[PDB]
């Protein structure tokens, strides 16, 4: 393709647990990450949606990370649209998506600069791991948990 994502986590590389949450009534949201080297960031956003905040969190993880990065997301949309764009680049049956295309195309630019990326989906779940902590962080003031 235009790139290849890793098929299993990159051993040794820092992992970013990304998440975003938005509120449909106000279009307010937050995107951010926590990492397994004790890094964290949360941004507040306006005029956004849940899909945009999930994508924005991924963008931030690519922005702030080294050449090799492990990314854990709970958004099937974000993983799919990114993986589809890579797999179907400059190829026959491609028609780029309508929604979020500006955000997705900036993500793709961040991506090909990387050496190696592992991007995986896990369902939102409860507990104390990374997805749980970043969920609470992006959900604060946006959504009851
Ligand atoms: C605010 C609720 O917790 C989350 O951040 C969250 C839940 C779901 Br469900 C998704 N998603 O991308 O499928 O992200
Ligand atoms: Mn999420
Ligand atoms: Mn979540
Ligand atoms: Zn390397
Ligand atoms: Zn977890």
GROMACS .gro file of N, CA and C and ligand atoms in nm:
model
  453
    1UNK      N    1   0.084  -0.119   0.000
    1UNK     CA    2   0.000   0.000   0.000
    1UNK      C    3   0.088   0.125   0.000
    2UNK      N    4   0.030   0.239   0.037
    2UNK     CA    5   0.108   0.361   0.057
    2UNK      C    6   0.198   0.350   0.180
    3UNK      N    7   0.169   0.253   0.267
    3UNK     CA    8   0.238   0.232   0.394
    3UNK      C    9   0.198   0.092   0.441
    4UNK      N   10   0.260   0.047   0.549
    4UNK     CA   11   0.211  -0.073   0.617
    4UNK      C   12   0.209  -0.049   0.766
    5UNK      N   13   0.095  -0.076   0.829
    5UNK     CA   14   0.090  -0.080   0.974
    5UNK      C   15   0.141  -0.215   1.024
    6UNK      N   16   0.192  -0.215   1.147
    6UNK     CA   17   0.246  -0.337   1.203
    6UNK      C   18   0.133  -0.435   1.233
    7UNK      N   19   0.166  -0.563   1.229
    7UNK     CA   20   0.066  -0.665   1.257
    7UNK      C   21   0.061  -0.708   1.403
    8UNK      N   22   0.157  -0.666   1.485
    8UNK     CA   23   0.150  -0.683   1.629
    8UNK      C   24   0.221  -0.565   1.693
    9UNK      N   25   0.202  -0.543   1.824
    9UNK     CA   26   0.270  -0.430   1.888
    9UNK      C   27   0.421  -0.432   1.866
   10UNK      N   28   0.476  -0.311   1.851
   10UNK     CA   29   0.620  -0.290   1.839
   10UNK      C   30   0.680  -0.303   1.978
   11UNK      N   31   0.765  -0.403   1.998
   11UNK     CA   32   0.821  -0.426   2.130
   11UNK      C   33   0.918  -0.313   2.164
   12UNK      N   34   0.912  -0.264   2.288
   12UNK     CA   35   0.996  -0.155   2.330
   12UNK      C   36   0.937  -0.016   2.308
   13UNK      N   37   0.854   0.002   2.205
   13UNK     CA   38   0.804   0.136   2.173
   13UNK      C   39   0.700   0.184   2.274
   14UNK      N   40   0.698   0.315   2.296
   14UNK     CA   41   0.600   0.375   2.385
   14UNK      C   42   0.459   0.359   2.327
   15UNK      N   43   0.362   0.325   2.413
   15UNK     CA   44   0.223   0.305   2.372
   15UNK      C   45   0.137   0.424   2.414
   16UNK      N   46   0.059   0.478   2.320
   16UNK     CA   47  -0.036   0.586   2.347
   16UNK      C   48  -0.178   0.529   2.348
   17UNK      N   49  -0.246   0.538   2.461
   17UNK     CA   50  -0.387   0.502   2.469
   17UNK      C   51  -0.468   0.628   2.442
   18UNK      N   52  -0.531   0.634   2.324
   18UNK     CA   53  -0.601   0.753   2.278
   18UNK      C   54  -0.750   0.738   2.303
   19UNK      N   55  -0.816   0.851   2.324
   19UNK     CA   56  -0.962   0.852   2.324
   19UNK      C   57  -1.012   0.993   2.302
   20UNK      N   58  -1.136   1.000   2.253
   20UNK     CA   59  -1.208   1.124   2.244
   20UNK      C   60  -1.354   1.100   2.277
   21UNK      N   61  -1.419   1.209   2.318
   21UNK     CA   62  -1.560   1.212   2.354
   21UNK      C   63  -1.613   1.349   2.316
   22UNK      N   64  -1.733   1.353   2.258
   22UNK     CA   65  -1.799   1.478   2.227
   22UNK      C   66  -1.945   1.470   2.270
   23UNK      N   67  -2.007   1.587   2.287
   23UNK     CA   68  -2.148   1.597   2.320
   23UNK      C   69  -2.224   1.655   2.201
   24UNK      N   70  -2.324   1.581   2.152
   24UNK     CA   71  -2.394   1.619   2.029
   24UNK      C   72  -2.475   1.748   2.045
   25UNK      N   73  -2.525   1.775   2.166
   25UNK     CA   74  -2.612   1.891   2.187
   25UNK      C   75  -2.535   2.022   2.175
   26UNK      N   76  -2.415   2.027   2.232
   26UNK     CA   77  -2.331   2.145   2.233
   26UNK      C   78  -2.217   2.141   2.131
   27UNK      N   79  -2.188   2.024   2.073
   27UNK     CA   80  -2.073   2.004   1.984
   27UNK      C   81  -1.941   2.032   2.055
   28UNK      N   82  -1.940   2.025   2.187
   28UNK     CA   83  -1.817   2.032   2.264
   28UNK      C   84  -1.759   1.893   2.285
   29UNK      N   85  -1.627   1.885   2.292
   29UNK     CA   86  -1.563   1.757   2.314
   29UNK      C   87  -1.422   1.775   2.364
   30UNK      N   88  -1.354   1.661   2.381
   30UNK     CA   89  -1.214   1.657   2.423
   30UNK      C   90  -1.146   1.537   2.359
   31UNK      N   91  -1.018   1.554   2.326
   31UNK     CA   92  -0.934   1.449   2.269
   31UNK      C   93  -0.802   1.445   2.345
   32UNK      N   94  -0.746   1.326   2.361
   32UNK     CA   95  -0.618   1.317   2.427
   32UNK      C   96  -0.565   1.175   2.433
   33UNK      N   97  -0.465   1.158   2.519
   33UNK     CA   98  -0.397   1.030   2.534
   33UNK      C   99  -0.337   1.022   2.673
   34UNK      N  100  -0.316   0.899   2.718
   34UNK     CA  101  -0.221   0.864   2.822
   34UNK      C  102  -0.129   0.757   2.765
   35UNK      N  103  -0.001   0.758   2.808
   35UNK     CA  104   0.098   0.666   2.754
   35UNK      C  105   0.160   0.584   2.866
   36UNK      N  106   0.227   0.474   2.830
   36UNK     CA  107   0.283   0.389   2.934
   36UNK      C  108   0.419   0.437   2.984
   37UNK      N  109   0.471   0.549   2.935
   37UNK     CA  110   0.580   0.618   3.002
   37UNK      C  111   0.531   0.741   3.078
   38UNK      N  112   0.409   0.735   3.130
   38UNK     CA  113   0.356   0.841   3.213
   38UNK      C  114   0.340   0.976   3.145
   39UNK      N  115   0.321   0.977   3.014
   39UNK     CA  116   0.288   1.098   2.940
   39UNK      C  117   0.136   1.110   2.928
   40UNK      N  118   0.086   1.234   2.924
   40UNK     CA  119  -0.057   1.252   2.902
   40UNK      C  120  -0.082   1.392   2.848
   41UNK      N  121  -0.190   1.406   2.773
   41UNK     CA  122  -0.233   1.533   2.716
   41UNK      C  123  -0.382   1.523   2.693
   42UNK      N  124  -0.453   1.634   2.717
   42UNK     CA  125  -0.596   1.645   2.688
   42UNK      C  126  -0.621   1.782   2.628
   43UNK      N  127  -0.693   1.787   2.518
   43UNK     CA  128  -0.729   1.914   2.458
   43UNK      C  129  -0.881   1.924   2.459
   44UNK      N  130  -0.931   2.046   2.470
   44UNK     CA  131  -1.073   2.073   2.456
   44UNK      C  132  -1.101   2.129   2.317
   45UNK      N  133  -1.218   2.095   2.263
   45UNK     CA  134  -1.249   2.120   2.123
   45UNK      C  135  -1.393   2.169   2.109
   46UNK      N  136  -1.419   2.251   2.007
   46UNK     CA  137  -1.554   2.301   1.980
   46UNK      C  138  -1.597   2.261   1.840
   47UNK      N  139  -1.728   2.258   1.818
   47UNK     CA  140  -1.784   2.233   1.684
   47UNK      C  141  -1.740   2.098   1.630
   48UNK      N  142  -1.732   1.998   1.718
   48UNK     CA  143  -1.673   1.868   1.691
   48UNK      C  144  -1.779   1.759   1.705
   49UNK      N  145  -1.740   1.635   1.671
   49UNK     CA  146  -1.824   1.517   1.689
   49UNK      C  147  -1.741   1.405   1.750
   50UNK      N  148  -1.808   1.296   1.787
   50UNK     CA  149  -1.738   1.186   1.852
   50UNK      C  150  -1.633   1.126   1.759
   51UNK      N  151  -1.668   1.108   1.632
   51UNK     CA  152  -1.570   1.062   1.534
   51UNK      C  153  -1.453   1.159   1.521
   52UNK      N  154  -1.479   1.289   1.516
   52UNK     CA  155  -1.368   1.383   1.502
   52UNK      C  156  -1.275   1.377   1.623
   53UNK      N  157  -1.332   1.373   1.744
   53UNK     CA  158  -1.248   1.367   1.864
   53UNK      C  159  -1.166   1.238   1.870
   54UNK      N  160  -1.224   1.124   1.830
   54UNK     CA  161  -1.145   1.001   1.823
   54UNK      C  162  -1.028   1.019   1.728
   55UNK      N  163  -1.054   1.076   1.611
   55UNK     CA  164  -0.948   1.100   1.513
   55UNK      C  165  -0.847   1.203   1.564
   56UNK      N  166  -0.894   1.305   1.633
   56UNK     CA  167  -0.803   1.410   1.677
   56UNK      C  168  -0.705   1.355   1.780
   57UNK      N  169  -0.753   1.267   1.868
   57UNK     CA  170  -0.666   1.200   1.964
   57UNK      C  171  -0.555   1.122   1.893
   58UNK      N  172  -0.590   1.047   1.788
   58UNK     CA  173  -0.488   0.975   1.711
   58UNK      C  174  -0.388   1.071   1.650
   59UNK      N  175  -0.436   1.181   1.592
   59UNK     CA  176  -0.346   1.282   1.537
   59UNK      C  177  -0.247   1.331   1.642
   60UNK      N  178  -0.296   1.358   1.763
   60UNK     CA  179  -0.209   1.405   1.870
   60UNK      C  180  -0.106   1.299   1.907
   61UNK      N  181  -0.144   1.172   1.903
   61UNK     CA  182  -0.049   1.068   1.941
   61UNK      C  183   0.063   1.058   1.838
   62UNK      N  184   0.031   1.071   1.709
   62UNK     CA  185   0.132   1.074   1.605
   62UNK      C  186   0.219   1.199   1.614
   63UNK      N  187   0.160   1.312   1.653
   63UNK     CA  188   0.233   1.438   1.663
   63UNK      C  189   0.341   1.433   1.771
   64UNK      N  190   0.308   1.375   1.886
   64UNK     CA  191   0.392   1.383   2.004
   64UNK      C  192   0.482   1.261   2.022
   65UNK      N  193   0.484   1.167   1.928
   65UNK     CA  194   0.552   1.040   1.949
   65UNK      C  195   0.675   1.028   1.861
   66UNK      N  196   0.763   0.936   1.901
   66UNK     CA  197   0.881   0.904   1.822
   66UNK      C  198   0.851   0.840   1.687
   67UNK      N  199   0.956   0.787   1.622
   67UNK     CA  200   0.942   0.728   1.490
   67UNK      C  201   0.865   0.597   1.491
   68UNK      N  202   0.852   0.534   1.607
   68UNK     CA  203   0.783   0.407   1.624
   68UNK      C  204   0.682   0.425   1.735
   69UNK      N  205   0.556   0.390   1.710
   69UNK     CA  206   0.454   0.420   1.810
   69UNK      C  207   0.348   0.310   1.810
   70UNK      N  208   0.304   0.274   1.930
   70UNK     CA  209   0.192   0.183   1.951
   70UNK      C  210   0.070   0.268   1.986
   71UNK      N  211  -0.039   0.251   1.912
   71UNK     CA  212  -0.160   0.331   1.933
   71UNK      C  213  -0.277   0.237   1.960
   72UNK      N  214  -0.341   0.252   2.076
   72UNK     CA  215  -0.459   0.173   2.112
   72UNK      C  216  -0.580   0.265   2.110
   73UNK      N  217  -0.676   0.235   2.022
   73UNK     CA  218  -0.798   0.313   2.008
   73UNK      C  219  -0.920   0.224   2.033
   74UNK      N  220  -1.030   0.284   2.078
   74UNK     CA  221  -1.156   0.212   2.093
   74UNK      C  222  -1.255   0.247   1.984
   75UNK      N  223  -1.211   0.318   1.881
   75UNK     CA  224  -1.299   0.367   1.775
   75UNK      C  225  -1.277   0.283   1.649
   76UNK      N  226  -1.377   0.201   1.614
   76UNK     CA  227  -1.366   0.119   1.494
   76UNK      C  228  -1.364   0.204   1.368
   77UNK      N  229  -1.443   0.312   1.367
   77UNK     CA  230  -1.440   0.406   1.256
   77UNK      C  231  -1.300   0.458   1.228
   78UNK      N  232  -1.234   0.511   1.332
   78UNK     CA  233  -1.102   0.570   1.314
   78UNK      C  234  -1.003   0.468   1.258
   79UNK      N  235  -1.002   0.346   1.314
   79UNK     CA  236  -0.909   0.245   1.263
   79UNK      C  237  -0.943   0.210   1.119
   80UNK      N  238  -1.071   0.190   1.090
   80UNK     CA  239  -1.110   0.152   0.955
   80UNK      C  240  -1.075   0.257   0.851
   81UNK      N  241  -1.118   0.381   0.873
   81UNK     CA  242  -1.099   0.482   0.770
   81UNK      C  243  -0.950   0.503   0.745
   82UNK      N  244  -0.868   0.505   0.851
   82UNK     CA  245  -0.724   0.519   0.832
   82UNK      C  246  -0.669   0.399   0.757
   83UNK      N  247  -0.704   0.278   0.801
   83UNK     CA  248  -0.648   0.158   0.737
   83UNK      C  249  -0.694   0.148   0.592
   84UNK      N  250  -0.819   0.188   0.565
   84UNK     CA  251  -0.869   0.184   0.427
   84UNK      C  252  -0.792   0.281   0.339
   85UNK      N  253  -0.771   0.403   0.388
   85UNK     CA  254  -0.700   0.505   0.311
   85UNK      C  255  -0.561   0.457   0.272
   86UNK      N  256  -0.488   0.399   0.368
   86UNK     CA  257  -0.356   0.344   0.339
   86UNK      C  258  -0.366   0.231   0.236
   87UNK      N  259  -0.455   0.134   0.260
   87UNK     CA  260  -0.459   0.015   0.175
   87UNK      C  261  -0.500   0.048   0.032
   88UNK      N  262  -0.585   0.148   0.014
   88UNK     CA  263  -0.640   0.184  -0.117
   88UNK      C  264  -0.581   0.314  -0.171
   89UNK      N  265  -0.451   0.338  -0.154
   89UNK     CA  266  -0.396   0.464  -0.203
   89UNK      C  267  -0.344   0.453  -0.346
   90UNK      N  268  -0.381   0.551  -0.428
   90UNK     CA  269  -0.344   0.559  -0.569
   90UNK      C  270  -0.395   0.440  -0.649
   91UNK      N  271  -0.495   0.369  -0.597
   91UNK     CA  272  -0.542   0.244  -0.652
   91UNK      C  273  -0.682   0.260  -0.712
   92UNK      N  274  -0.724   0.156  -0.787
   92UNK     CA  275  -0.835   0.163  -0.882
   92UNK      C  276  -0.967   0.212  -0.821
   93UNK      N  277  -1.031   0.129  -0.738
   93UNK     CA  278  -1.165   0.160  -0.693
   93UNK      C  279  -1.175   0.261  -0.581
   94UNK      N  280  -1.083   0.357  -0.573
   94UNK     CA  281  -1.078   0.448  -0.458
   94UNK      C  282  -1.162   0.572  -0.483
   95UNK      N  283  -1.244   0.604  -0.383
   95UNK     CA  284  -1.314   0.731  -0.371
   95UNK      C  285  -1.300   0.773  -0.226
   96UNK      N  286  -1.226   0.881  -0.200
   96UNK     CA  287  -1.198   0.922  -0.063
   96UNK      C  288  -1.328   0.954   0.010
   97UNK      N  289  -1.329   0.944   0.143
   97UNK     CA  290  -1.454   0.966   0.216
   97UNK      C  291  -1.493   1.112   0.213
   98UNK      N  292  -1.621   1.136   0.238
   98UNK     CA  293  -1.670   1.272   0.248
   98UNK      C  294  -1.639   1.329   0.386
   99UNK      N  295  -1.695   1.267   0.489
   99UNK     CA  296  -1.685   1.321   0.624
   99UNK      C  297  -1.542   1.311   0.677
  100UNK      N  298  -1.501   1.414   0.750
  100UNK     CA  299  -1.374   1.420   0.823
  100UNK      C  300  -1.252   1.417   0.732
  101UNK      N  301  -1.268   1.440   0.601
  101UNK     CA  302  -1.158   1.416   0.508
  101UNK      C  303  -1.038   1.505   0.539
  102UNK      N  304  -1.062   1.629   0.583
  102UNK     CA  305  -0.950   1.716   0.618
  102UNK      C  306  -0.872   1.659   0.736
  103UNK      N  307  -0.942   1.617   0.841
  103UNK     CA  308  -0.874   1.560   0.956
  103UNK      C  309  -0.802   1.431   0.918
  104UNK      N  310  -0.870   1.342   0.847
  104UNK     CA  311  -0.810   1.214   0.810
  104UNK      C  312  -0.687   1.235   0.723
  105UNK      N  313  -0.688   1.337   0.637
  105UNK     CA  314  -0.573   1.356   0.550
  105UNK      C  315  -0.453   1.414   0.625
  106UNK      N  316  -0.476   1.494   0.729
  106UNK     CA  317  -0.364   1.535   0.813
  106UNK      C  318  -0.307   1.417   0.891
  107UNK      N  319  -0.394   1.329   0.942
  107UNK     CA  320  -0.346   1.209   1.009
  107UNK      C  321  -0.255   1.129   0.916
  108UNK      N  322  -0.298   1.111   0.790
  108UNK     CA  323  -0.223   1.031   0.694
  108UNK      C  324  -0.086   1.092   0.668
  109UNK      N  325  -0.078   1.225   0.669
  109UNK     CA  326   0.051   1.291   0.653
  109UNK      C  327   0.141   1.263   0.772
  110UNK      N  328   0.087   1.273   0.894
  110UNK     CA  329   0.164   1.236   1.013
  110UNK      C  330   0.213   1.092   1.003
  111UNK      N  331   0.131   1.005   0.947
  111UNK     CA  332   0.158   0.861   0.946
  111UNK      C  333   0.277   0.825   0.857
  112UNK      N  334   0.280   0.874   0.733
  112UNK     CA  335   0.387   0.828   0.645
  112UNK      C  336   0.523   0.883   0.688
  113UNK      N  337   0.526   0.988   0.770
  113UNK     CA  338   0.653   1.031   0.829
  113UNK      C  339   0.707   0.930   0.930
  114UNK      N  340   0.622   0.843   0.984
  114UNK     CA  341   0.668   0.751   1.086
  114UNK      C  342   0.752   0.639   1.024
  115UNK      N  343   0.835   0.578   1.108
  115UNK     CA  344   0.901   0.454   1.069
  115UNK      C  345   0.807   0.335   1.083
  116UNK      N  346   0.747   0.317   1.201
  116UNK     CA  347   0.657   0.204   1.223
  116UNK      C  348   0.541   0.247   1.311
  117UNK      N  349   0.421   0.206   1.274
  117UNK     CA  350   0.302   0.235   1.353
  117UNK      C  351   0.224   0.106   1.376
  118UNK      N  352   0.185   0.084   1.501
  118UNK     CA  353   0.090  -0.020   1.537
  118UNK      C  354  -0.038   0.048   1.585
  119UNK      N  355  -0.148   0.025   1.515
  119UNK     CA  356  -0.276   0.085   1.550
  119UNK      C  357  -0.378  -0.026   1.565
  120UNK      N  358  -0.433  -0.041   1.686
  120UNK     CA  359  -0.523  -0.151   1.717
  120UNK      C  360  -0.652  -0.101   1.781
  121UNK      N  361  -0.760  -0.174   1.757
  121UNK     CA  362  -0.890  -0.146   1.818
  121UNK      C  363  -0.912  -0.238   1.936
  122UNK      N  364  -0.958  -0.181   2.047
  122UNK     CA  365  -1.015  -0.260   2.157
  122UNK      C  366  -1.150  -0.200   2.193
  123UNK      N  367  -1.248  -0.280   2.232
  123UNK     CA  368  -1.374  -0.221   2.278
  123UNK      C  369  -1.348  -0.136   2.402
  124UNK      N  370  -1.422  -0.027   2.412
  124UNK     CA  371  -1.428   0.046   2.538
  124UNK      C  372  -1.462  -0.053   2.647
  125UNK      N  373  -1.390  -0.046   2.757
  125UNK     CA  374  -1.414  -0.139   2.866
  125UNK      C  375  -1.384  -0.067   2.995
  126UNK      N  376  -1.426  -0.126   3.106
  126UNK     CA  377  -1.401  -0.067   3.236
  126UNK      C  378  -1.281  -0.134   3.299
  127UNK      N  379  -1.226  -0.067   3.399
  127UNK     CA  380  -1.105  -0.116   3.460
  127UNK      C  381  -1.011  -0.001   3.484
  128UNK      N  382  -0.880  -0.030   3.481
  128UNK     CA  383  -0.778   0.067   3.516
  128UNK      C  384  -0.671   0.080   3.411
  129UNK      N  385  -0.677   0.003   3.302
  129UNK     CA  386  -0.578   0.017   3.197
  129UNK      C  387  -0.579   0.154   3.133
  130UNK      N  388  -0.504   0.168   3.023
  130UNK     CA  389  -0.490   0.298   2.959
  130UNK      C  390  -0.619   0.351   2.898
  131UNK      N  391  -0.693   0.265   2.825
  131UNK     CA  392  -0.817   0.311   2.761
  131UNK      C  393  -0.916   0.362   2.865
  132UNK      N  394  -0.920   0.298   2.982
  132UNK     CA  395  -1.010   0.341   3.088
  132UNK      C  396  -0.973   0.481   3.138
  133UNK      N  397  -0.843   0.508   3.158
  133UNK     CA  398  -0.802   0.635   3.217
  133UNK      C  399  -0.823   0.751   3.121
  134UNK      N  400  -0.783   0.733   2.994
  134UNK     CA  401  -0.802   0.838   2.896
  134UNK      C  402  -0.950   0.858   2.867
  135UNK      N  403  -1.032   0.753   2.878
  135UNK     CA  404  -1.176   0.771   2.865
  135UNK      C  405  -1.228   0.869   2.968
  136UNK      N  406  -1.200   0.841   3.096
  136UNK     CA  407  -1.243   0.933   3.202
  136UNK      C  408  -1.192   1.075   3.176
  137UNK      N  409  -1.068   1.088   3.127
  137UNK     CA  410  -1.012   1.222   3.102
  137UNK      C  411  -1.085   1.295   2.989
  138UNK      N  412  -1.120   1.225   2.881
  138UNK     CA  413  -1.188   1.298   2.776
  138UNK      C  414  -1.337   1.309   2.804
  139UNK      N  415  -1.390   1.227   2.895
  139UNK     CA  416  -1.533   1.228   2.924
  139UNK      C  417  -1.570   1.335   3.026
  140UNK      N  418  -1.472   1.384   3.101
  140UNK     CA  419  -1.497   1.482   3.205
  140UNK      C  420  -1.559   1.608   3.144
  141UNK      N  421  -1.677   1.644   3.194
  141UNK     CA  422  -1.745   1.763   3.148
  141UNK      C  423  -1.810   1.747   3.013
  142UNK      N  424  -1.792   1.632   2.948
  142UNK     CA  425  -1.854   1.603   2.820
  142UNK      C  426  -1.960   1.495   2.831
  143UNK      N  427  -1.938   1.394   2.916
  143UNK     CA  428  -2.026   1.279   2.924
  143UNK      C  429  -2.024   1.215   3.063
  144UNK      N  430  -2.142   1.176   3.113
  144UNK     CA  431  -2.150   1.092   3.231
  144UNK      C  432  -2.089   0.957   3.201
  145UNK      N  433  -2.004   0.910   3.293
  145UNK     CA  434  -1.936   0.782   3.276
  145UNK      C  435  -2.012   0.669   3.347
  146LIG     C1  436  -1.739   0.900   2.619
  146LIG     C2  437  -1.758   0.747   2.615
  146LIG     O1  438  -1.630   0.679   2.614
  146LIG     C3  439  -1.551   0.692   2.501
  146LIG     O2  440  -1.460   0.775   2.494
  146LIG     C4  441  -1.590   0.624   2.392
  146LIG     C5  442  -1.694   0.541   2.389
  146LIG     C6  443  -1.706   0.487   2.268
  146LIG    BR1  444  -1.848   0.367   2.224
  146LIG     C7  445  -1.615   0.534   2.182
  146LIG     N1  446  -1.596   0.496   2.053
  146LIG     O3  447  -1.492   0.556   1.966
  146LIG     O4  448  -1.665   0.373   2.001
  146LIG     O5  449  -1.525   0.625   2.268
  147LIG    MN1  450  -1.353   0.631   2.239
  148LIG    MN1  451  -1.371   0.575   2.544
  149LIG    ZN1  452   1.308   0.257   1.457
  150LIG    ZN1  453  -0.785  -0.140   2.940
   0.00000   0.00000   0.00000
